[PDB]
């Protein structure tokens, strides 16, 4: 749903730099609030836990 979509390239040939939008995807995972779950309602805390 968001913009500036980047992909980790083929790191074995000519790609030694890291994936620059790492903290972007991390912020997506931290802000990922849910209401679904079979075991129960799952939601990430400030440490990324249940």
């Amino acid at each position: 749903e968001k913009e500036n979509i980047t992909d980790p390239p083929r790191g074995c040939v000519g790609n030694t730099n890291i994936w620059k939008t790492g903290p972007l995807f991390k912020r997506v995972l931290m802000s990922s609030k849910y209401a679904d779950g079979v075991t129960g309602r799952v939601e990430f805390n400030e440490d990324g836990d249940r």
Binding site: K20, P23, L24, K26, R27, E46
Partner: protein, 50 residues
């Protein structure tokens, strides 16, 4: 020591909340603890905000 309170950067900058944290800075010496490109982005935002 006249130590200003610790500014904490949790996620990537939105220029909505991190801008307010940079506006709280009014001391002389700024101690920055991050990576290289994050330091480049923080110095570019500090130059853009004066």
């Amino acid at each position: 020591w006249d130590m200003q309170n610790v500014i904490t950067l949790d996620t990537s900058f939105e220029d909505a909340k991190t801008q307010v944290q940079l506006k709280k800075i009014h001391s002389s010496v700024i101690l920055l603890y991050c990576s290289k490109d994050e330091a480049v982005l923080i110095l570019s935002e500090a130059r853009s905000l004066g």
